[PDB]
Amino acid sequence: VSQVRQNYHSDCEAAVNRMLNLELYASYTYSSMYAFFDRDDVALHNVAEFFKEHSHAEREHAEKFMKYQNKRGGRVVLQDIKKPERDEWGNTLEAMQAALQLEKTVNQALLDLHKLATDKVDPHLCDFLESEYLEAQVKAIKRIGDFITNLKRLGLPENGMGEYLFDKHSVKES
Amino acid sequence: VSQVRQNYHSDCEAAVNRMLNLELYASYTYSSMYAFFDRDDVALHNVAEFFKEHSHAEREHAEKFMKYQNKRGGRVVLQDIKKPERDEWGNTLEAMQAALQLEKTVNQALLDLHKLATDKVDPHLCDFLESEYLEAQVKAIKRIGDFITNLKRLGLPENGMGEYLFDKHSVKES
Amino acid sequence: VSQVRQNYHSDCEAAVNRMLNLELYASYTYSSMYAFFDRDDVALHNVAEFFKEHSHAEREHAEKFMKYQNKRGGRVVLQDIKKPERDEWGNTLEAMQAALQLEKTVNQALLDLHKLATDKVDPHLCDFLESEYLEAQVKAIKRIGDFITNLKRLGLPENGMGEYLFDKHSVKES
Amino acid sequence: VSQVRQNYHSDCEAAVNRMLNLELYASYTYSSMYAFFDRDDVALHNVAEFFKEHSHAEREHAEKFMKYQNKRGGRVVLQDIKKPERDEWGNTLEAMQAALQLEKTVNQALLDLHKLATDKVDPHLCDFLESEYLEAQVKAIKRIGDFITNLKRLGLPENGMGEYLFDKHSVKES
Ligand SMILES: [Cl-]
Ligand SMILES: [Cl-]
Ligand SMILES: [Cl-]
Ligand SMILES: [Cl-]
Ligand SMILES: [Cl-]
Ligand SMILES: [Cl-]
Ligand SMILES: [Cl-]
Ligand SMILES: [Cl-]
Ligand SMILES: [Cl-]
Ligand SMILES: [Cl-]
Ligand SMILES: [Cl-]
Ligand SMILES: [Cl-]
Ligand SMILES: [Cl-]
Ligand SMILES: [Cl-]
Ligand SMILES: [Cl-]
Ligand SMILES: [Cl-]
Ligand SMILES: [Cl-]
Ligand SMILES: [Cl-]
Ligand SMILES: [Cl-]
Ligand SMILES: [Cl-]
Ligand SMILES: [Cl-]
Ligand SMILES: [Cl-]
Ligand SMILES: [Cl-]
Ligand SMILES: [Cl-]
Ligand SMILES: [Cl-]
Ligand SMILES: [Cl-]
Ligand SMILES: [Cl-]
Ligand SMILES: [Cl-]
Ligand SMILES: [Cl-]
Ligand SMILES: [Cl-]
Ligand SMILES: [Cl-]
Ligand SMILES: [Cl-]
Ligand SMILES: [Cl-]
Ligand SMILES: [Cl-]
Ligand SMILES: [Cl-]
Ligand SMILES: [Cl-]
Ligand SMILES: [Cl-]
Ligand SMILES: [Cl-]
Ligand SMILES: [Cl-]
Ligand SMILES: [Cl-]
Ligand SMILES: [Cl-]
Ligand SMILES: [Cl-]
Ligand SMILES: [Cl-]
Ligand SMILES: [Cl-]
Ligand SMILES: [Cl-]
Ligand SMILES: [Cl-]
Ligand SMILES: [Cl-]
Ligand SMILES: [Cl-]
Ligand SMILES: [Cl-]
Ligand SMILES: [Cl-]
Ligand SMILES: [Cl-]
Ligand SMILES: [Cl-]
Ligand SMILES: [Cl-]
Ligand SMILES: [Cl-]
Ligand SMILES: [Cl-]
Ligand SMILES: [Cl-]
Ligand SMILES: [Cl-]
Ligand SMILES: [Cl-]
Ligand SMILES: [Cl-]
Ligand SMILES: [Cl-]
Ligand SMILES: [Cl-]
Ligand SMILES: [Cl-]
Ligand SMILES: [Cl-]
Ligand SMILES: [Cl-]
Ligand SMILES: [Cl-]
Ligand SMILES: [Cl-]
Ligand SMILES: [Cl-]
Ligand SMILES: [Cl-]
Ligand SMILES: [Cl-]
Ligand SMILES: [Cl-]
Ligand SMILES: [Cl-]
Ligand SMILES: [Cl-]
Ligand SMILES: [Cl-]
Ligand SMILES: [Cl-]
Ligand SMILES: [Fe+2]
Ligand SMILES: [Fe+2]
Ligand SMILES: [Fe+2]
Ligand SMILES: [Fe+2]
Ligand SMILES: [Mg+2]
Ligand SMILES: [Mg+2]
Ligand SMILES: [Mg+2]
Ligand SMILES: [Mg+2]
Ligand SMILES: [Mg+2]
Ligand SMILES: [Mg+2]
Ligand SMILES: [Mg+2]
Ligand SMILES: [Mg+2]
Ligand SMILES: [Mg+2]
Ligand SMILES: [Mg+2]
Ligand SMILES: [Mg+2]
Ligand SMILES: [Mg+2]
Ligand SMILES: [Mg+2]
Ligand SMILES: [Mg+2]
Ligand SMILES: [Mg+2]
Ligand SMILES: [Mg+2]
Ligand SMILES: [Mg+2]
Ligand SMILES: [Mg+2]
Ligand SMILES: [Mg+2]
Ligand SMILES: [Mg+2]
Ligand SMILES: [Mg+2]
Ligand SMILES: [Mg+2]
Ligand SMILES: [Mg+2]
Ligand SMILES: [Mg+2]
Ligand SMILES: [Mg+2]
Ligand SMILES: [Mg+2]
Ligand SMILES: [Mg+2]
Numbered sequence: 001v002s003q004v005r006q007n008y009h010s011d012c013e014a015a016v017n018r019m020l021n022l023e024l025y026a027s028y029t030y031s032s033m034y035a036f037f038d039r040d041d042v043a044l045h046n047v048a049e050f051f052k053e054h055s056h057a058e059r060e061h062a063e064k065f066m067k068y069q070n071k072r073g074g075r076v077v078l079q080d081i082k083k084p085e086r087d088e089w090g091n092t093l094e095a096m097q098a099a100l101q102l103e104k105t106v107n108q109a110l111l112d113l114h115k116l117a118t119d120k121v122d123p124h125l126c127d128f129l130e131s132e133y134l135e136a137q138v139k140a141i142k143r144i145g146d147f148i149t150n151l152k153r154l155g156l157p158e159n160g161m162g163e164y165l166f167d168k169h170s171v172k173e174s
Numbered sequence: 175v176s177q178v179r180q181n182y183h184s185d186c187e188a189a190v191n192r193m194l195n196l197e198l199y200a201s202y203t204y205s206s207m208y209a210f211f212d213r214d215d216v217a218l219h220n221v222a223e224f225f226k227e228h229s230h231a232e233r234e235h236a237e238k239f240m241k242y243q244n245k246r247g248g249r250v251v252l253q254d255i256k257k258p259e260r261d262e263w264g265n266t267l268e269a270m271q272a273a274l275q276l277e278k279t280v281n282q283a284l285l286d287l288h289k290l291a292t293d294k295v296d297p298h299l300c301d302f303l304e305s306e307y308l309e310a311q312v313k314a315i316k317r318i319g320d321f322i323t324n325l326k327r328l329g330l331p332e333n334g335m336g337e338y339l340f341d342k343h344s345v346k347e348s
Numbered sequence: 349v350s351q352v353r354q355n356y357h358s359d360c361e362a363a364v365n366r367m368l369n370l371e372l373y374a375s376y377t378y379s380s381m382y383a384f385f386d387r388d389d390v391a392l393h394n395v396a397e398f399f400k401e402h403s404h405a406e407r408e409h410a411e412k413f414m415k416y417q418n419k420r421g422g423r424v425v426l427q428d429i430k431k432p433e434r435d436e437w438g439n440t441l442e443a444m445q446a447a448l449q450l451e452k453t454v455n456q457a458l459l460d461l462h463k464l465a466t467d468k469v470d471p472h473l474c475d476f477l478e479s480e481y482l483e484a485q486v487k488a489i490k491r492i493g494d495f496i497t498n499l500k501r502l503g504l505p506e507n508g509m510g511e512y513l514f515d516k517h518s519v520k521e522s
Numbered sequence: 523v524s525q526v527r528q529n530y531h532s533d534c535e536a537a538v539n540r541m542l543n544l545e546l547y548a549s550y551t552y553s554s555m556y557a558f559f560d561r562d563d564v565a566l567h568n569v570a571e572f573f574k575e576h577s578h579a580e581r582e583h584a585e586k587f588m589k590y591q592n593k594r595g596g597r598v599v600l601q602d603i604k605k606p607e608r609d610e611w612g613n614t615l616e617a618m619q620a621a622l623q624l625e626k627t628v629n630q631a632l633l634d635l636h637k638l639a640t641d642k643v644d645p646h647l648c649d650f651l652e653s654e655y656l657e658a659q660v661k662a663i664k665r666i667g668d669f670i671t672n673l674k675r676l677g678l679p680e681n682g683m684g685e686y687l688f689d690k691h692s693v694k695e696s
Contacts, residue, residue, distance in 0.1 A: 104354055111355055114471045130475040138472055142419045145352040146217035153334035162335055169342050178388045178667040180626055181633055202429065209414045209424040214352045226411075233407075237400075240383045245664045250383040255376065255429035297636045298660055301652040391668035508675035509684055516691050 002073030009120040013074035015113050020065040021079050022109050026102055027058035029084040033099070036089045044167040047092050049174035054099070061133070068128060092163050093148065093156035100144045107137040147171075176247030183294040187248035189287050194239040195253050196283050200276055201232035203258040207273070210263045218341040221266050223348035228273070235307070242302060266337050267322065267330035274318045281311040321345075350421030357468040361422035363461050368413040369427050370457050374450055375406035377432040381447070384437045392515040395440050397522035402447070409481070416476060440511050441496065441504035448492045455485040495519075524595030531642040535596035537635050542587040543601050544631050548624055549580035551606040555621070558611045566689040569614050571696035576621070583655070590650060614685050615670065615678035622666045629659040669693075 030051045037048030069076050089095040110133050117125035150170055154162030204225045211222030243250050263269040284307050291299035324344055328336030378399045385396030417424050437443040458481050465473035498518055502510030552573045559570030591598050611617040632655050639647035672692055676684030 100351065107354055111471070115469065118471075126471070130471055134472045134475060138419050141352045141354070142214055145214040145350075145421075146219075148351065149215055149217040150338060153338055155335060159335070162338075165335070165338065169338075176388055176667075177622065177670065178663045180629055180663070198429075202426070205411075205414075206424070206426055209418065212415065212418045213423070214350055214418065214421060237379075240379075241386065244383065244386045244388065245660050247388060247667075249387070250380070251435060252376070252380055252431045254431050255372075257426045257428050261425060295637065297633070297640075297648070297652055298656045301656060388664055388667040389671055391671040393668075509677060509681070509687070512672060512675055512684075512687065512691075 002075075004071075005073030007122060007124070008072045008074060009122065012113075012117055012120055012122055012125055013069065013072070014077075015116055016065055016069050016074060017077045017079075019109055019113055020062050020069075020076070021081070022106060023058050023062035023065065024081045026106055027055045027062065028081050029102060030055035030058060030099075032084040032086070033089050033095050036095070037092075044092060044163070046167045046171040046174055047095070050171045051095070051099075061136075064132060072124075091157050092166060093151045096144055096148050096151060100141065100148060103137060103141050103144060107134075107141065110134060110137060176249075178245075179247030181296060181298070182246045182248060183296065186287075186291055186294055186296055186299055187243065187246070188251075189290055190239055190243050190248060191251045191253075193283055193287055194236050194243075194250070195255070196280060197232050197236035197239065198255045200280055201229045201236065202255050203276060204229035204232060204273075206258040206260070207263050207269050210269070211266075218266060218337070220341045220345040220348055221269070224345045225269070225273075235310075238306060246298075265331050266340060267325045270318055270322050270325060274315065274322060277311060277315050277318060281308075281315065284308060284311060350423075352419075353421030355470060355472070356420045356422060357470065360461075360465055360468055360470055360473055361417065361420070362425075363464055364413055364417050364422060365425045365427075367457055367461055368410050368417075368424070369429070370454060371406050371410035371413065372429045374454055375403045375410065376429050377450060378403035378406060378447075380432040380434070381437050381443050384443070385440075392440060392511070394515045394519040394522055395443070398519045399443070399447075409484075412480060420472075439505050440514060441499045444492055444496050444499060448489065448496060451485060451489050451492060455482075455489065458482060458485060524597075526593075527595030529644060529646070530594045530596060531644065534635075534639055534642055534644055534647055535591065535594070536599075537638055538587055538591050538596060539599045539601075541631055541635055542584050542591075542598070543603070544628060545580050545584035545587065546603045548628055549577045549584065550603050551624060552577035552580060552621075554606040554608070555611050555617050558617070559614075566614060566685070568689045568693040568696055569617070572693045573617070573621075583658075586654060594646075613679050614688060615673045618666055618670050618673060622663065622670060625659060625663050625666060629656075629663065632656060632659060 033051035034048050034055060036042055037044045037051060066076050086098070089098065110129055114126060114129045114134070117129065147166075147170060151162070151166055154166055156163055156166075207225035208222050208229060210216055211218045211225060240250050260272070263272065284303055288300060288303045288308070291303065321340075321344060325336070325340055328340055330337055330340075381399035382396050382403060384390055385392045385399060414424050434446070437446065458477055462474060462477045462482070465477065495514075495518060499510070499514055502514055504511055504514075555573035556570050556577060558564055559566045559573060588598050608620070611620065632651055636648060636651045636656070639651065669688075669692060673684070673688055676688055678685055678688075
């Protein structure tokens, strides 16, 4: 037993490792979207940068779970980071739809971890999730939903002018 | 009788209370429009902020009538603030059309109050309306009319790209 | 179903709308107290300003619930804002007693909403209430209780000098 | 006829001269109150300064009527400035009551001048009164009424501690 460990269930330790892997998986998916929008035959630079920044944020989420695991006396166990579901992402609308689904998958895993922490009577882990993860997911989901609404209004997928304008006006200029 | 009261007719006092209620009603309508444009399935942020700011301005108009009432020795009497006419506002064009109508309803009430103040030979109340309310209404009505003209030019309600562009270019970026 | 909605029960959505209305009701009550203390026959300016600021804070509380509703994919539904219970508030002691009761009514509604969120296993809503609402209520209740103790010490309601001194020394000079 | 004169009735010219005299009369009354509160057996310095400043303001009001008269092509005609009604002013409450009455006498004269200007179809004179005089009177009357309410709350005339506290806290420290 780690000398620091107190009130930390083995099941929670394992679930934190699984959650870490999912954050890394999400990072990698976002990195793939970055590279896609940077292609010369796609060329939506601001969209590409949005996904690159999302990729970096997910890596930070993963690192924060590593630090958490060690703070509680659990042991980080890494698994393979699976490659993303697609090699090409269609267009801004398809990519944003995939991002929404991914953020909701991540959110569900966080909510499930909170259920487990609640079941094991671990208020520190509950606090950590509530204070560092759950609101970030709600914000991200809202942002991406708002984007999808605007992409549909702009006539995606068919309206190339609409897609061009989204990249100029809806995402940060990079 | 209030020790400060001088040349202030009971009818004017009552009409000021009714006008206060109408300002609060207008505030609440604008708040509803804010919340509508903030919906994930509407997502026109700058339009939402325009209405939020309008809501705040109407609350200031109401507070200024409360202060006025007390300065003259009248007594503030509050009534229920009725909920807005609609729960959802369609799109930017429909909302702006409703806003134009609301501003003209408020303006008519102010003009009617000025008629009453004139009839009761209350130059202080006339001055107050002319100096603090009537020009603000004319300016607001002109601004919203100009917006409606531009929304029609942009192809509302059908042209979603037009609606997107209005939010980017016609209202302040927030 | 809203594209953003996840783990958000219909009952919680409805209770958030009811809570929004109560915040607006509280705002309106505080606005009435402001106008009362601004009367020429009451004339306790610092007390009036305390209530005006409280009114503004409650409106901010309401707006934060509107934003929350939309973040979760619920839909804001507004009802009439009922006028306050009284048209005149007696004196500083009676008004502070009414304010204490109102803050405890608001607090009970927030606690009841937290119970519902707990029952529906909504940790995001629990966090929101705990992080943005519950401590603010405890602080406000303590502040107003402290004021009431001091008003009683100062001989309210009979001791007019005591009431005068409270306005000079216990509430912020405005 | 003055070369500048246009739309300026003889009756209005005369009434402006009478109003000028009343402003000077009010100034002189306030000067008397200043000297009273500066007496060693009265010794309420902040109250004295309040009245001294009021005296100066009334002289400015008079000078503005002189300038107005000449701008319109009327001719300033001065009469004696009558001494104030009392040689001693009792206490802060009695003086404030006299000040309230004086401000309402001045206000009535201004309102009567506005009636005359209206009757003679002189919108410039109406504007001048509304923009430079009528709101100043409403503000002054409200301020003095608020003071009287507070003096009564503080137990005037009998409560000397109350009178002392009013001078420290209700009027500007000089
Ligand atoms: Cl343990
Ligand atoms: Cl334990
Ligand atoms: Cl264990
Ligand atoms: Cl593991
Ligand atoms: Cl794993
Ligand atoms: Cl593996
Ligand atoms: Cl596998
Ligand atoms: Cl996919
Ligand atoms: Cl693929
Ligand atoms: Cl997914
Ligand atoms: Cl889990
Ligand atoms: Cl727990
Ligand atoms: Cl968070
Ligand atoms: Cl947010
Ligand atoms: Cl957007
Ligand atoms: Cl299209
Ligand atoms: Cl198209
Ligand atoms: Cl957008
Ligand atoms: Cl009257
Ligand atoms: Cl009159
Ligand atoms: Cl009347
Ligand atoms: Cl009324
Ligand atoms: Cl009403
Ligand atoms: Cl009502
Ligand atoms: Cl009704
Ligand atoms: Cl409508
Ligand atoms: Cl509707
Ligand atoms: Cl209307
Ligand atoms: Cl009217
Ligand atoms: Cl008039
Ligand atoms: Cl105006
Ligand atoms: Cl203008
Ligand atoms: Cl425009
Ligand atoms: Cl079109
Ligand atoms: Cl179209
Ligand atoms: Cl425009
Ligand atoms: Cl749901
Ligand atoms: Cl869940
Ligand atoms: Cl549900
Ligand atoms: Cl509801
Ligand atoms: Cl309700
Ligand atoms: Cl209702
Ligand atoms: Cl009802
Ligand atoms: Cl009550
Ligand atoms: Cl009542
Ligand atoms: Cl209550
Ligand atoms: Cl509830
Ligand atoms: Cl929960
Ligand atoms: Cl809080
Ligand atoms: Cl505290
Ligand atoms: Cl206190
Ligand atoms: Cl006492
Ligand atoms: Cl007493
Ligand atoms: Cl003191
Ligand atoms: Cl205190
Ligand atoms: Cl002439
Ligand atoms: Cl003419
Ligand atoms: Cl003439
Ligand atoms: Cl003359
Ligand atoms: Cl004279
Ligand atoms: Cl003479
Ligand atoms: Cl004489
Ligand atoms: Cl006298
Ligand atoms: Cl005398
Ligand atoms: Cl007089
Ligand atoms: Cl006259
Ligand atoms: Cl005229
Ligand atoms: Cl003025
Ligand atoms: Cl004022
Ligand atoms: Cl005062
Ligand atoms: Cl007393
Ligand atoms: Cl006494
Ligand atoms: Cl002090
Ligand atoms: Cl005072
Ligand atoms: Fe993440
Ligand atoms: Fe208004
Ligand atoms: Fe509140
Ligand atoms: Fe004057
Ligand atoms: Mg060891
Ligand atoms: Mg284990
Ligand atoms: Mg996994
Ligand atoms: Mg594989
Ligand atoms: Mg937080
Ligand atoms: Mg946004
Ligand atoms: Mg009275
Ligand atoms: Mg009446
Ligand atoms: Mg009405
Ligand atoms: Mg109804
Ligand atoms: Mg103006
Ligand atoms: Mg313009
Ligand atoms: Mg949908
Ligand atoms: Mg429902
Ligand atoms: Mg309710
Ligand atoms: Mg009712
Ligand atoms: Mg917490
Ligand atoms: Mg906190
Ligand atoms: Mg304290
Ligand atoms: Mg000549
Ligand atoms: Mg003449
Ligand atoms: Mg005279
Ligand atoms: Mg004489
Ligand atoms: Mg007329
Ligand atoms: Mg006029
Ligand atoms: Mg003015
Ligand atoms: Mg004041």
